[PDB]
PDB file of C-alpha atoms and ligand atoms in Angstrom:
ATOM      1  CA  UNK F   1       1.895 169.734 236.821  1.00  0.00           C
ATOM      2  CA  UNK F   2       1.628 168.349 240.493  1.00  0.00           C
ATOM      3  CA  UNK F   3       4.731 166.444 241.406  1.00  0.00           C
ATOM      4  CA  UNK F   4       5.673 164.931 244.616  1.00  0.00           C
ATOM      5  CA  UNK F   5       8.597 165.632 246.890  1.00  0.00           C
ATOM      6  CA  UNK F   6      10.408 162.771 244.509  1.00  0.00           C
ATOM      7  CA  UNK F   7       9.803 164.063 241.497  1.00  0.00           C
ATOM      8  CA  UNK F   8       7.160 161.709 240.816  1.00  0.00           C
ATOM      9  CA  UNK F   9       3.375 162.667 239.565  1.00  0.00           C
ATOM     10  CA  UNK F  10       0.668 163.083 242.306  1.00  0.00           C
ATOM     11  CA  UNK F  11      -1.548 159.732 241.901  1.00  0.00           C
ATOM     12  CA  UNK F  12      -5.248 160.856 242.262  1.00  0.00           C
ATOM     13  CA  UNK F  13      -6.922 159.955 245.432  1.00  0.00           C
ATOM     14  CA  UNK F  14      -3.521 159.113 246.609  1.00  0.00           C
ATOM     15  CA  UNK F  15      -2.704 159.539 250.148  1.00  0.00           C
ATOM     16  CA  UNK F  16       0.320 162.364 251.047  1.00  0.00           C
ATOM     17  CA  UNK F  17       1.971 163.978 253.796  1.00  0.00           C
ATOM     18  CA  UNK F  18       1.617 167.973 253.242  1.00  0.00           C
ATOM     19  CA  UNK F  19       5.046 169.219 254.700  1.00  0.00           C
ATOM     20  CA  UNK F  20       6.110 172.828 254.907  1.00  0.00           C
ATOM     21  CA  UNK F  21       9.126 173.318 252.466  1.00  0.00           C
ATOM     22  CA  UNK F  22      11.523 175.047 255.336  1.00  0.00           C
ATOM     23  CA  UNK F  23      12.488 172.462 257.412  1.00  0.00           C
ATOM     24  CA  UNK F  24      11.838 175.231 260.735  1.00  0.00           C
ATOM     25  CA  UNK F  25       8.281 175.778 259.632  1.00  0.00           C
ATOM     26  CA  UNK F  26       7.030 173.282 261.649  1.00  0.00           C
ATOM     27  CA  UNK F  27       5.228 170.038 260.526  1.00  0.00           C
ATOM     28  CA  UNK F  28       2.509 168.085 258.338  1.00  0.00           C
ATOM     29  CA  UNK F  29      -1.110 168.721 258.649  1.00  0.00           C
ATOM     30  CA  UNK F  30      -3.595 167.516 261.123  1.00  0.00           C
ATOM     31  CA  UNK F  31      -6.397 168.484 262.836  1.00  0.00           C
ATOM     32  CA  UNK F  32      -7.793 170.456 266.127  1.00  0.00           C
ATOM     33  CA  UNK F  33     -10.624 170.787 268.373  1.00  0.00           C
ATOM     34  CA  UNK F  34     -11.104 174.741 268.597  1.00  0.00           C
ATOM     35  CA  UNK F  35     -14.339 176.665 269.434  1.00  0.00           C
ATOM     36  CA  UNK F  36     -17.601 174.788 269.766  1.00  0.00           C
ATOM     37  CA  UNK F  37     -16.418 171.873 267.970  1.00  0.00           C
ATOM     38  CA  UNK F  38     -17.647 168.223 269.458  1.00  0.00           C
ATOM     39  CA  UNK F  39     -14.419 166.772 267.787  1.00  0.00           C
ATOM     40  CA  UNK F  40     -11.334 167.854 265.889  1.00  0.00           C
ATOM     41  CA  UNK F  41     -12.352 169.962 262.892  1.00  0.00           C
ATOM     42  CA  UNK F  42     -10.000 172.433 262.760  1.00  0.00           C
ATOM     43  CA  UNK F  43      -7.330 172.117 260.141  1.00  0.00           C
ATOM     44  CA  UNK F  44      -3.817 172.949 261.291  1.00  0.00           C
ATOM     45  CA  UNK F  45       0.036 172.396 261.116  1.00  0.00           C
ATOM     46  CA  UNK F  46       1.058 170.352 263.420  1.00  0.00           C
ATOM     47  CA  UNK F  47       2.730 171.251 266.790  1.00  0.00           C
ATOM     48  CA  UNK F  48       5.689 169.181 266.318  1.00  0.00           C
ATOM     49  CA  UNK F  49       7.984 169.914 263.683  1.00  0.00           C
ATOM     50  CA  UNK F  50       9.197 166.226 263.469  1.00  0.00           C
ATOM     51  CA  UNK F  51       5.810 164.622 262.576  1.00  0.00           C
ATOM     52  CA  UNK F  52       4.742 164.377 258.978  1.00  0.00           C
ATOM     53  CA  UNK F  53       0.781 164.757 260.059  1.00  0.00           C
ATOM     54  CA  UNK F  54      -1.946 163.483 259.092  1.00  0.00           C
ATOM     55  CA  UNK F  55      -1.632 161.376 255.323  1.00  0.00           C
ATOM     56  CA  UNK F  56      -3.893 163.175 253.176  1.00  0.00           C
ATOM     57  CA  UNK F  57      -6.061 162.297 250.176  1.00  0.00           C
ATOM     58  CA  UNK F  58      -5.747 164.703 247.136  1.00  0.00           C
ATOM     59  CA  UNK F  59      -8.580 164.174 244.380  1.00  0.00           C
ATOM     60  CA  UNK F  60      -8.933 166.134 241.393  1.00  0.00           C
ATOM     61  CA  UNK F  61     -12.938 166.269 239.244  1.00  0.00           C
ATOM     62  CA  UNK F  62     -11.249 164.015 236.653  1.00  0.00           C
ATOM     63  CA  UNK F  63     -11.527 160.219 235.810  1.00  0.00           C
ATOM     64  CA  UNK F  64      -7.262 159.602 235.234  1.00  0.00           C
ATOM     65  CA  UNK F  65      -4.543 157.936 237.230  1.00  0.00           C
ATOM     66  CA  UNK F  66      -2.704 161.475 237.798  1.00  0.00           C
ATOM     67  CA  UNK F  67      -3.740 165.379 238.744  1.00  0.00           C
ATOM     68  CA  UNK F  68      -4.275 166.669 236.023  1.00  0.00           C
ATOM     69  CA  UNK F  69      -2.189 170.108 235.096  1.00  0.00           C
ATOM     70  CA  UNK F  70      -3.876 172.572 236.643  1.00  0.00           C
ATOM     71  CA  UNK F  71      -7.260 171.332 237.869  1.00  0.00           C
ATOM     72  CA  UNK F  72      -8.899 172.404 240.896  1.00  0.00           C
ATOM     73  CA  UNK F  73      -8.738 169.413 243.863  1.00  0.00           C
ATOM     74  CA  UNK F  74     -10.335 168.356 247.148  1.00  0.00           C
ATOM     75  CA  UNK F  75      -8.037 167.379 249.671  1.00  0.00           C
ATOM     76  CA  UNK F  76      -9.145 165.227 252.646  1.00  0.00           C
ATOM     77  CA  UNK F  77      -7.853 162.964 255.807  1.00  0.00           C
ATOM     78  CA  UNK F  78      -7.538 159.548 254.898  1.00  0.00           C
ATOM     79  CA  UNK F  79      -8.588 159.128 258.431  1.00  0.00           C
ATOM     80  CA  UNK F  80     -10.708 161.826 259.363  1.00  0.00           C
ATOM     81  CA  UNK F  81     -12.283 162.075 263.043  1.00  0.00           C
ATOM     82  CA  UNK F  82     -15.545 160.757 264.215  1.00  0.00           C
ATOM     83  CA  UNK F  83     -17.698 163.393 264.279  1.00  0.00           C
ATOM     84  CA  UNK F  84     -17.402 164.925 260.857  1.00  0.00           C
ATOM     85  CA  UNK F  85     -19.453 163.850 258.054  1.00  0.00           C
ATOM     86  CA  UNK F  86     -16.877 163.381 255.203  1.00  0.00           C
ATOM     87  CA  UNK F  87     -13.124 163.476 254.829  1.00  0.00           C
ATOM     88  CA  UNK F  88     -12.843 166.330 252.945  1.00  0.00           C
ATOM     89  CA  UNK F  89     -11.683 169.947 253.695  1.00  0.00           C
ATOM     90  CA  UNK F  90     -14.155 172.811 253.032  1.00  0.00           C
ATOM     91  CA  UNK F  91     -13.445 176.664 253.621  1.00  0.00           C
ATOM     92  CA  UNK F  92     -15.905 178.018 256.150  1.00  0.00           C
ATOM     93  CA  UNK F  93     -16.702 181.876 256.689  1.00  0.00           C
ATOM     94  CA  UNK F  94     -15.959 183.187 259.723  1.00  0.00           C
ATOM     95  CA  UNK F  95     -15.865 187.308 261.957  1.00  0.00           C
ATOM     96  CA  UNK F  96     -11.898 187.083 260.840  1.00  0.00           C
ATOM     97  CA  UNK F  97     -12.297 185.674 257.704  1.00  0.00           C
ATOM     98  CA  UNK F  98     -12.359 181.864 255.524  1.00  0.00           C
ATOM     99  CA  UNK F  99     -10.671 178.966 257.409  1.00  0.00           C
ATOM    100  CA  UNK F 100     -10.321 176.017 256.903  1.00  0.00           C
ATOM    101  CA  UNK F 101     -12.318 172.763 258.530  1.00  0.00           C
ATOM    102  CA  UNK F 102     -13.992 169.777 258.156  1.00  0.00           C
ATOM    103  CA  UNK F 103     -17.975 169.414 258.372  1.00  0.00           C
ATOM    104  CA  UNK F 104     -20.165 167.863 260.834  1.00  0.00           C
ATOM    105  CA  UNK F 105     -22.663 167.664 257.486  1.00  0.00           C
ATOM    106  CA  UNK F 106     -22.138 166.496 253.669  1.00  0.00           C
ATOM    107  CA  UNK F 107     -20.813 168.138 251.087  1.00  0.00           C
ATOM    108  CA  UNK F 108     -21.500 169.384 247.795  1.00  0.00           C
ATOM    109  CA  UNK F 109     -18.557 169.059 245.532  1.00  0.00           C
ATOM    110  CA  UNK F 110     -18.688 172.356 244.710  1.00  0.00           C
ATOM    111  CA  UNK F 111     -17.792 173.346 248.406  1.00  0.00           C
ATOM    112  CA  UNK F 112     -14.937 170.575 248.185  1.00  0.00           C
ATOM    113  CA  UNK F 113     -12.956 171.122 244.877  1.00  0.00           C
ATOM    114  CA  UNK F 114     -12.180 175.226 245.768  1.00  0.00           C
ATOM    115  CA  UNK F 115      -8.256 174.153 245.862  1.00  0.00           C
ATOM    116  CA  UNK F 116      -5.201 174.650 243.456  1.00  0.00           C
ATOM    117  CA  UNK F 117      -2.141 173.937 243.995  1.00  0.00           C
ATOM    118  CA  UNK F 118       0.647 176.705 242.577  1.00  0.00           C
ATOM    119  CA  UNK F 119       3.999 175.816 241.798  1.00  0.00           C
ATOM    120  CA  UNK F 120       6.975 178.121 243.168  1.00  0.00           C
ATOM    121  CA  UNK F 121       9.670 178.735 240.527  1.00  0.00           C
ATOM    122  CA  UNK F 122      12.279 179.877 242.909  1.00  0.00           C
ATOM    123  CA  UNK F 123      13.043 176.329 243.836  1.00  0.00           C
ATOM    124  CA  UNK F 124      15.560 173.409 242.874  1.00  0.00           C
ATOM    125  CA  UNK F 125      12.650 170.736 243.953  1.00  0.00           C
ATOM    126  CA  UNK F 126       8.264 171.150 243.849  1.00  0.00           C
ATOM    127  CA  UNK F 127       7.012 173.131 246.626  1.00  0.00           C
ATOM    128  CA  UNK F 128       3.598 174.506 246.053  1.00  0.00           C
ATOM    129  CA  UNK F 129       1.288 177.504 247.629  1.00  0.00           C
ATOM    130  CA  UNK F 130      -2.128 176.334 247.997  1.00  0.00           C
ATOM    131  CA  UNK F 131      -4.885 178.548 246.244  1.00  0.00           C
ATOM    132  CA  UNK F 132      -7.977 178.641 247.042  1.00  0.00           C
ATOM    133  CA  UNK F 133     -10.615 179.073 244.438  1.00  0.00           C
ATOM    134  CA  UNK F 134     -14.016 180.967 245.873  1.00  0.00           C
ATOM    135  CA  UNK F 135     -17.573 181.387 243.605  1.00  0.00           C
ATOM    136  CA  UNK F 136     -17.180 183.154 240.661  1.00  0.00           C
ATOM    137  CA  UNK F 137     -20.864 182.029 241.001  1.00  0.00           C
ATOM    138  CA  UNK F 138     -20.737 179.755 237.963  1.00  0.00           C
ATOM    139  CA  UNK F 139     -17.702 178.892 238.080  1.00  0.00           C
ATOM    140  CA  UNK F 140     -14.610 179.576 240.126  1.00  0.00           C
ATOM    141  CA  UNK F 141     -11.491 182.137 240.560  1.00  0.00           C
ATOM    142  CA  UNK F 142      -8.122 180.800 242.058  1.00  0.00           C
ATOM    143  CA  UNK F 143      -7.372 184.306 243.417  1.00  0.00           C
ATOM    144  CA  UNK F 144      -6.554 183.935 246.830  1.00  0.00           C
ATOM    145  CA  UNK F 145      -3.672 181.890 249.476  1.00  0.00           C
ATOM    146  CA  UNK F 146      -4.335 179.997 251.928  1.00  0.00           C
ATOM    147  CA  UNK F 147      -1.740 180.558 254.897  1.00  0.00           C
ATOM    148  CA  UNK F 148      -1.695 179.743 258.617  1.00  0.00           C
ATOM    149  CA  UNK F 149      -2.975 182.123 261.654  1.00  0.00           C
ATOM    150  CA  UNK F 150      -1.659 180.975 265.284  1.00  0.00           C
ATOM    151  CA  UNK F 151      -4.749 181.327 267.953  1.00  0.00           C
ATOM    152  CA  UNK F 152      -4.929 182.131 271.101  1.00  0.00           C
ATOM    153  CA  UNK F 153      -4.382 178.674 272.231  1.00  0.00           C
ATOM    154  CA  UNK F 154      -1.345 178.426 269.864  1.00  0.00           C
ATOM    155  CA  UNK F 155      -3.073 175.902 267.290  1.00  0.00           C
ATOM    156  CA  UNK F 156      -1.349 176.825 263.795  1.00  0.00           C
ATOM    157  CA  UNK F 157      -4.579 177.547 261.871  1.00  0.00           C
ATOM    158  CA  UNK F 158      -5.085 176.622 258.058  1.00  0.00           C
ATOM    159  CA  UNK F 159      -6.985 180.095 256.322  1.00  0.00           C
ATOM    160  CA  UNK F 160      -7.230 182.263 253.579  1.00  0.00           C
ATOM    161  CA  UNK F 161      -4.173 184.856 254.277  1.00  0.00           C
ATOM    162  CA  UNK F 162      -3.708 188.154 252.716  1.00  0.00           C
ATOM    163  CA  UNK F 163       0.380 187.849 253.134  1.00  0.00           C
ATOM    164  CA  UNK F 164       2.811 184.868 253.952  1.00  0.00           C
ATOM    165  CA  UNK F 165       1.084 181.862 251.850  1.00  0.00           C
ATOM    166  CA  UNK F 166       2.158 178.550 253.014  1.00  0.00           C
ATOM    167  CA  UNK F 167       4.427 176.664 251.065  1.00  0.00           C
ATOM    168  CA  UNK F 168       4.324 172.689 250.823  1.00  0.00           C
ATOM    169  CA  UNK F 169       5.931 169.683 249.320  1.00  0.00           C
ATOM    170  CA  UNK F 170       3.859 166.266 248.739  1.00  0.00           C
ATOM    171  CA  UNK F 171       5.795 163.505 250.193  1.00  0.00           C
ATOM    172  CA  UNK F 172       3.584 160.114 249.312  1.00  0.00           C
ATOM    173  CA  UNK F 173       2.613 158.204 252.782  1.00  0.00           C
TER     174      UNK F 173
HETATM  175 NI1   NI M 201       9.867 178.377 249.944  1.00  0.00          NI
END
């Protein structure tokens, strides 16, 4: 089951704060302007290890008032910037491999709802890893992390890791 940093069930399309679960890890999630990008599409971890980020909307395929135990969600800024075309996160291929980013162009859902999140049981509280789920062509596979990959410019880059997963609790915003 998802639970939030209280204890309290994840409300779906309810608006969170994704914070690492080691306090020195840094901060919530936000975004960044790297590359070619007109705007900030670039999903990160914040720079300053005293802001919560961005609040972020976690949906789930499901009609209910919760997340469902163990369904596959979409996660997206409640607030997203101007120039992309939807809210929602999507995992875009890349020379070094899947990151994560927002779109300039819609969606399908199927490009959207490719996350899980996986509880840790070494822990007193919840603190999830985030899976990500690519094409099993018909359907999907949860087989892979998503972790964070520091650039050249320093910007604490959301993408599919083969080591080090990122860790997070849900603290409602
Ligand atoms: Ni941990």
């Amino acid at each position: 089951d998802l639970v939030d940093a209280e204890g309290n069930l994840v409300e779906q399309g309810g608006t969170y704060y994704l914070l690492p679960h080691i306090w020195a890890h840094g901060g919530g999630i936000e975004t960044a302007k790297t590359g070619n990008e007109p705007c900030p599409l670039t999903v990160v971890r914040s720079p300053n290890e005293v802001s919560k980020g961005e609040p972020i909307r976690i949906s789930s395929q499901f009609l209910s008032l919760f997340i469902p135990r163990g369904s596959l969600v979409a996660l997206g800024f409640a607030n997203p910037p101007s120039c992309a075309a939807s809210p929602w996160w999507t995992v875009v291929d890349s020379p070094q491999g899947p990151a994560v980013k927002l779109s300039q162009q819609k969606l399908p859902e199927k490009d959207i709802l490719v996350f899980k999140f996986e509880k840790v049981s070494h822990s007193n509280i919840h603190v999830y890893k985030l899976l990500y789920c690519q094409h099993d062509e018909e359907d999907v596979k949860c087989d892979q992390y998503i972790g964070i990959h520091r650039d050249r410019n320093g910007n604490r880059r959301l993408v599919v890791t083969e080591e080090n997963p990122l860790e997070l609790v849900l603290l409602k915003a």
